[PDB]
Each structure stands twice: as structure tokens, then as C-alpha cells.
Symmetry: C3
Subunit: 385 residues, 3 copies
């Protein structure tokens, strides 16, 4: 698409509320706001593809706050816009939020290890930073970008959605398509549910036919099931739950098989972690290990792919995947399946840097159309031509 087309698309969307605001969960934003992230994403790509610098800050920091793929993804986005990243180690939160912010425009936060704690922690940082700006402590109001929490993974989900839009030739062609978000076997102890919950909560916004397929006992956060049901019932398409991998793969257009630990188990883990009972934690993680040992047959196999739409549904995975007979003895996907989609899987990952930059752009530029246009006319070369 040409540059004129991108600007014209933004003009028929409404997104004034994204300015000087945070980004936590995809479903806290409107459909227009989500579409403004996609379009600004592609616009920044267009400009960089044509050797046009999109630096919008002459100085200022972006605070990275972990508690290494998203590490480089955030660093990339900041540098593209002209921000310099600083990493932080790991009313105390209020104090930490003001002390790091004096010359910070952005704060990216990853906190995904504990159910309940991660999302609340980001709200506290935002609130603290809002008050500091009001009380004159801070010259600006830093906007927060959720780089992964216990509830959602918005940068991953939106990068995944944008991949689909480009693979199927527009956001409207996603309507009616069948996406299988399923569980798969991992040797690992227990992975967060942010990706499964994140793409189920997002794809349901895009009018798709979404199916959540996991073995019994691996239920996701029930409040995210409720968000998906609403989404589908309100803005078209469907949401379905099932305990059969085959039933989900059958006639699927898209396939997303990644493992996760049971929501309930993560609630226990956090309470035990809060109580301090390390002996209980060790037992819980051993109990999970042998529970998911009973579902090794959950693997994205060449036989399963065969029962997909034309035997070639787009395989998606956030990476890295557990590849059977390469990364581990038994895993999420067969080697030959992975290899055949390798190019698509990497191209999928390429959208993440642009998605974070778009979120930053939208939260810091009151008139994106004008500034994007200003940046295009000046045409500052990022490389020597």
C-alpha cells in the first residue's frame, strides 16, 4: 500500500483516547483503536523500508522494567523513535515510579510469573506517574506499555493479528476464518497463560471463528473466556471451547498450538509464593509435570496438519517452540511441520518491534497523520543512500 492510503485509513478511524494513555489489555481498547495500531505499525514499516527515519524524540528515556526476545524488541522500538532504553534491575512502587521517570517518556513492563500481581503492579505504576505529573514532580506523564503480564500479551497478540491481516490480504478477509488456539505438550514446568488468553481475547474482536482446545483441567482464566464470548456474540463470529485437539484442527484455517499451565494451578502457586511455602511450590510443580505427562499426544503433527483446510493452515507460534526430536524428546510440534513454516514464523515475529513502536507513537503524538506526513516530507535518511 502507498503512503497516501495509510493516512486515509487513519482518517476514517477514531483514536483520540490513545494519546497520553497506557496499553494494558487489548480488550480495554476499541476496535478503531486496535486498527490504529495496525495502520501505524505498517506505516512505520513503509517508511523504514524506504530509508526514511521516523525519529520523533531528540532526547529522553524509555524505561525497561523486567521482573531476551522482547528485550531486543523493546530496545528496537525505542531506538526507532529516538528514545534510549535503560534497564531497571527487578509506598515503595510509587517512589520507584517517580524516581526513574524524571526524563522518561515511556515505561515498558514485563511481569508475567504470578496471577493477580502483574496487572495490579502496572496500574500502581501508572497511577503514581499520573499523580507525579499533576503535582509538578514530573515534567511529563510517562505512558506504559504492557510487554507481558499474567492476563494478556498485547504486543504479541497484536503482532500475531497483524501477521494474519497481511497473510490473508486485509482485516476484512479474517471474517469467517477458523483459528485453533490449542494446548500442546511441553517438557517445561508451567508456562503463563498470557498468550492463549491474549489471542483468544483478540481474534474474537476480528470476527473470526475461534476455538479454545485444551485437555480437561487446563482451563484458562474464566474472566478471559467471558471476554471472548462477549466479543464474538457482540461483533460477529464465534467462540467455542473443546477438549479435543482433532475437532479443533478439522478444517482449521489457522493453527496456534502452544502449551500453558492450568489457571487454577497458577492461583495456588501465587498463594504459596505469598505465604512463602517453598516446599508446597516444589510439590505443585512436580504435580503439574506428571499431569501434562498424560497428554504427550497433544502435538502439532503432520497427520493433524493433513486434516486442516487443504492440509496447509497457517501454523503460528510466538517462539521458541518445543520441537520434537530437536529441542527435546517430545514437544509441541513435529520437525517437518515447523521447518515448512519457518519463514512465516519468523516474519510473524518481525511485527512485534513495529507494534510496540506504534503503541508508543499513538500515546505520544496528538496528531499522528500530520507528524507521519511531516516525517515523510522531510525524508531524513536512516542509512546513507
Amino acid at each position: 500500500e502507498t503512503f497516501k492510503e495509510y493516512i486515509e485509513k487513519l482518517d476514517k478511524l477514531e483514536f483520540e483516547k490513545m494519546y497520553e494513555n497506557d496499553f494494558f489489555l487489548t480488550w480495554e481498547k476499541t476496535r478503531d483503536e486496535l486498527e490504529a495500531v495496525f495502520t501505524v505499525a505498517d506505516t512505520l514499516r513503509y517508511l523504514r523500508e524506504n530509508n526514511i527515519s521516523t525519529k520523533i524524540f531528540d532526547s529522553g528515556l524509555g524505561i525497561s522494567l523486567f521482573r531476551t526476545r522482547t528485550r531486543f524488541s523493546f530496545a528496537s522500538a525505542c531506538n526507532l523513535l529516538g528514545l534510549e532504553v535503560q534497564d531497571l534491575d527487578e509506598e515503595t512502587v510509587r517512589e520507584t515510579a517517580n524516581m526513574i521517570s524524571f526524563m522518561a517518556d515511556i515505561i515498558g513492563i514485563r511481569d508475567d510469573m504470578y496471577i493477580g500481581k502483574g496487572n495490579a503492579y502496572m496500574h500502581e505504576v501508572s497511577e503514581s506517574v499520573q499523580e507525579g505529573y499533576k503535582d509538578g514532580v514530573l515534567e511529563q506523564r510517562p505512558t506504559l506499555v504492557n510487554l507481558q503480564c499474567d492476563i494478556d500479551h498485547p504486543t504479541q497478540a497484536m503482532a500475531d493479528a497483524l501477521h494474519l491481516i497481511h497473510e490473508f490480504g486485509g482485516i476484512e478477509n479474517l471474517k469467517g476464518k477458523k483459528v485453533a488456539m490449542t494446548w500442546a505438550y511441553s517438557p517445561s514446568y508451567g508456562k503463563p497463560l498470557s498468550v492463549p488468553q491474549g489471542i483468544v481475547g483478540l481474534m474474537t474482536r476480528l470476527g473470526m471463528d475461534v476455538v479454545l482446545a485444551h485437555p480437561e483441567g487446563y482451563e484458562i482464566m474464566p474472566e478471559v473466556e467471558e471476554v471472548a464470548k462477549k466479543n464474538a456474540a457482540e461483533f460477529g463470529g464465534n467462540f467455542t471451547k473443546t477438549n479435543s485437539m482433532a475437532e479443533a484442527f478439522k478444517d482449521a484455517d489457522v493453527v496456534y498450538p502452544k502449551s500453558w499451565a492450568p489457571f487454577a494451578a497458577m492461583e495456588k502457586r501465587t498463594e504459596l509464593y505469598g505465604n512463602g511455602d517453598q516446599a508446597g511450590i516444589d510439590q505443585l510443580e512436580q504435580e503439574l509435570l506428571s499431569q501434562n505427562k498424560k497428554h504427550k499426544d497433544w502435538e502439532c503433527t503432520e497427520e493433524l496438519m493433513k486434516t486442516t483446510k487443504d492440509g496447509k493452515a497457517l501454523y503460528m507460534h510466538c517462539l521458541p517452540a518445543d520441537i520434537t526430536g530437536v529441542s527435546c524428546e517430545e514437544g509441541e510440534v513435529e520437525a517437518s511441520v515447523f521447518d515448512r513454516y519457518r519463514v512465516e514464523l519468523y516474519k510473524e515475529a518481525s511485527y512485534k518491534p513495529y507494534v510496540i513502536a506504534a503503541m508508543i507513537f499513538l500515546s505520544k503524538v496528538k496528531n499522528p497523520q500530520k507528524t507521519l506526513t511531516d516525517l515523510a516530507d522531510k525524508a531524513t535518511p536512516r542509512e546513507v543512500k
Copy 2:
């Protein structure tokens, strides 16, 4: 204040000796030189508040040299001026000083754990770097900024002084004001004396009525007492020593209650550390723990605040403070007292980034007035307007 006023103030100060020089101790600089740091501090703030970039380096490094609040403070200052920070791990010093400096304009150093070692280490680095410049090894002469040593904490003290100037409406209104630099209870083993010595050595320059209040046995470096006595006797005001917290708080205009380990004890600690005797160190730190256990009553309490000027002296603390019943069982300050000054305490901290930038600016720009004016006329936007 307007921009014209800042330049005119610099014009009636003399500071030619700050160019291509280091900053170690506040009392090694003249009163005019100190006032040039305040004014350049406020000028850079003025410019950034009005969206005007103050980048003065197109490329070059600022070497950070620790041996996380000042970490971000130094990184902020460097980035504001256009320098990129690089962290170093922790005639060998001479070699290290030349090898890191080839494309370094600034070196910030924090070395505050051992009495005698820290200040000597910075002199050696400076000297090495001076000689390298003379012998053609180095294209430039990197200027050093003391980010905290065993003797003084110049960036903290000057940020604290600048806070006062803005709270009381000018540097001349500080004359006659009563500042209580006192000890307080901390559960921690033993904190450096750089802050207490630093603000006693600085506030005595500003014609204030300074009182050093600590329990018997907690004497500061006696050479810093001598600097304060001289300061007061020479440039007006007073310096007093006392072993009563109440007597210091009575009618105080400003109150600075932070704990520190006895100077003498720090001399032992270093000798033991030099001798290698770890068994002695462990005993010394246990001996301190129960010594300051006998002075839990040294706390900035709501009853003490009540005996201050109008019951509302400006509470100052470098942060973080030991808050009783929040951060610890028994600490430096009562929660309600802390909370009521929280806004001021954070605003105090905001001056540190600008103080470091000013020191850098003054050490690298032969004509500050002209360049500050050049930067104002060009008016390069740091953010999109």
C-alpha cells in the same frame, strides 16, 4: 524566571576555571562556581520545560564507573546532552583510565564504601587521563564527576541546595535560616557519611545557620568539621555541634535527619578490609548494630516536627528513608511526617539529573552563555509539538 534573566546572572559570576576541570568536593570550588551550577541547572530545566533540546554532543561516551538512583540520574544527564552512557564492571588504574577514554568525554565515578580510598582513586584516574591527553594517546581530556565518594556527595548536596533556593525564593533568602543536619535511627549496618558531611560542607557556604546533631560517638570526619567552621566564620552564618536532637530541631527552618556510621568505625573497617581480616569486619559491624540500637529514640517524629518553626520546617532526605512501621519496625521518620512532605521530597530528587548535566555542561563548554543562547534560538524540539 525568563531566559534573559538566567544569562544575565551568569554574566555577573566568574567561572572560567570550571572549563576542562573535574568536580570532586563542593568546597574545592568558589562561591561563584557553585552559583554557576545552580543557574545552568535551572536554565537546562527551563529549556526542556519549553520543549527545547539541549544536545551538545553529536557522538561520544560518558563512562559510568561504579565500585540504582544515581545510575538513572547519570544516564539521564548524559542523554540530555547527547552523550551515550557505558557502564564499567567494577599502573592498573592508569591503564584502565586510558583504555576506556578514547572516545569518552565524561567519567562519572561512585566509590563510597571505604574511607581514604575513594577520593584518591578519582585523583589517580583524572591524573592518568590528563597525562594521556598531553602525550597524544587521547584526542580529548575527559572530565570527572564525583557521583559519590567517602568524603562528599556533591551532586546530592547541590541538588539539595537548589531545592532550598527554589523553596525559599532565592539564594539570598537562605541567609539566617536554621538547618538541622541530624542523625536518625537506621536498622542498616553502617551508611557512609558523605551526605551529612556534604550538606554541612555546602550549607555553610550559603550563610545558613547550620547545626550538626548526632549522638556521642558518631563524629563525622574531623577535617569536614574544620571546613564547615571555616566556611561559616569566613562567609557569614554559623556552624554548631550538639548531642541533642531536640536542641537542633527547636525553631529549625529546615530538617535533614539521616543516619550514618561513625567516621572512626569506618577507618577501622577499611584497615581490616586492607589487612584482609574478614572475622574482624563481621565483629565490627555487629558492634555498630547494637551501638546504634541504643539510640532508637533518634527519629524525626510528629512531636519533634511540632517544635520546629511554625511546626512545618521543610523535611529533607536524599531517599530512600527508613519509615517507621512501613519499611521497617523502627526507623528514621514517622509515616505521617514522611507522607506530608512526599511531594517536596520527590521534587528535591528531580534536581539531581539537572545538577549532573550542569557540571558536565560547565566542564565542556568554554562559553556557556553563547551556546545556551544558540540552543535557545535554534529551538530544536525534543518532542513533536
Copy 3:
């Protein structure tokens, strides 16, 4: 030399193949290509010496990939050209190579601990990154700079060669000169052979009279001996092997005495490391310790220096050196010898940042003459004048 002279020198060299290519081993490049690195090195120095910024990237990353002197050397080079460095911790390599590269223009790699593994690892990264560019995963093709491997140390060797060119007044004056690359005693377990192999493989290109002097049993990689023999026999000068330190020092114009572990021993070490046999490794390193204990007499001494050309051959060492009676009980060089050449040794090290920048420049600028000239005419100040 003036700027006009540098450009004219580049014009009578051919180096079109360096564009969008990697730099692994000095002997994989032509003599003209090597001379293009020297000239671009000196040109960037000339420009910076005259306060002229040489930033060529407005945004983009340089990935540093270790597996602290070259750390700062790489960071310096990147920043000079406008790139921002990001450090990485330590088909998986293929995945890692694409995931870090989305907005990376350069990748510097240090991997020098294991014979066979290091050079192969860089070829795999390059190949992966090449394919990604072809398949549309990557917007650009990142060029690799070998920051040190098991075979060569190209940035060190070229910095060393450039030092010589400036010490003896041109690359043509090196012809006929006698360079003693010799072993020396180190207390350390076992150092890589990349420096000895690197300068023997390079100096033989420059028509010099190179002698490899090491005690029996310390043979270097035999394939690098073969490269040196060829070099000398093909492009003039000589290569000789000897087991006498004196014979190598006699009438030497240049002296390079640094220790290294026997090539053969490094082959064992890696196999043991590959087999996992840690008990064998511990024994092998103890066997080396007492082997080189039998050659403490291999020291660059004041008596040896006396038998050099005029008793003042240029002493060279990559640094840091083992100095006898300062850094250790017994080492590579006598203190008085080291001290007298300290200035030259540091100036030698100063070329490394410019050598890395030159390699980057040549791999990313299709017309160096034009852009270097463009940068000179614009004359963007790096410092305020």
C-alpha cells in the same frame, strides 16, 4: 596527511567486494581491501580530530555478542557511526540470528575459548542472516565483524599493523623490517592463539621479515603457519620458525612477546569439553601450568631489548601484559621495559576503535569516497566549538 590525500589513496585501491560482506580472517581479504581499512581508519580519525561528526546511521542497532576492552572498543565504534549497541547474554542459532536482527545493521561476535567452534559459529550466523534477507524476514542484511575467534583476531592485528604504519612512516617502510612474534611466560592457565596467529598471518602480507619464536611444544595452528609461508613466498619478505628467543630478538626492529597455550592442547580441551569430561579438563590445565613453568626464562627483559636494533625495537603487546614484580611474581616483561614503551602501547590500543568503525563503514557504504566527502563538507560538529 590532508583529507584530499586520503580520498586519492582510496581511488587507487579496489575494494568493491567489502560492501555488504563480513570480516572474519585478515587473510580472506585482498591486500587492497586491507589497505582500504587502514585508510578509512585514518580518515575517520582525521575527521574526529577536526571536530567533524561521522554519523552515518540515524537509527539502528549493532548487536554485541560475547560467548571488557573490546566491549568498549565495539561500543565506541558503533556510537561514532550513530549505531546503538545492544548486548546479548551468551536450528537454534539460525533462530537467534533472525530474531535479534530485525533492526540490526551490524553484529560483532567474540568467541575465542574453543578451537573449531568459534569460526563455524560465525559462518552459521552470517548464513542465517543472509537467508533471512533473501526470504523477506529481514529488511537488511547485517554484516558481521569478528571481534575475536579461535583462529584470528582481525581487529587487534589490523590495529597493530596500523600502529606500525604510523610509527615507521608508511606501509612501504615496513618492507624488510624484522618482527619477532614470540612466546613469553604467563602464570595464567592457557590463553588463545588468536593474537599470535593473527599478527603472523597479517605481517606476512606487508612484506616484513616475520619470525615465530616459541618453545618446543607450543606450535600454533599448522594451517596458519601455512598461510604465513604462502604470504611471504608470494608477496615478498620471509617467515621463519625457531625455538630460541634470543635468535628472534637479535637485530629485531619490532618485538611482540605474548604467551599462548599450545594449539594441540586446545584441541584436547575442546574434545573434553564436547565429551563433557570436566575431570580431564582440570587435569589438562594443571598439566599446562607446570609445562610452561619450565620456561619462565621466556621474558622480554632489559638484556634482551639490548640485543635489538639499536637496543630500542618497538615493543608491542595487545594488553594487558603480565609485568614481572607488579602484576605477578614472574611474567611476560620487565617493569622498566614496559614503562619506557607505555605511551606507544596505549597509542597502539587507540587504533582498535577506528579499525572496527572502518570495517563497519566499508561494509555499509557503497561509495566511501563520496560519503566521507559529504561528511567533510557538511562538517557537523561533534562538540560545541
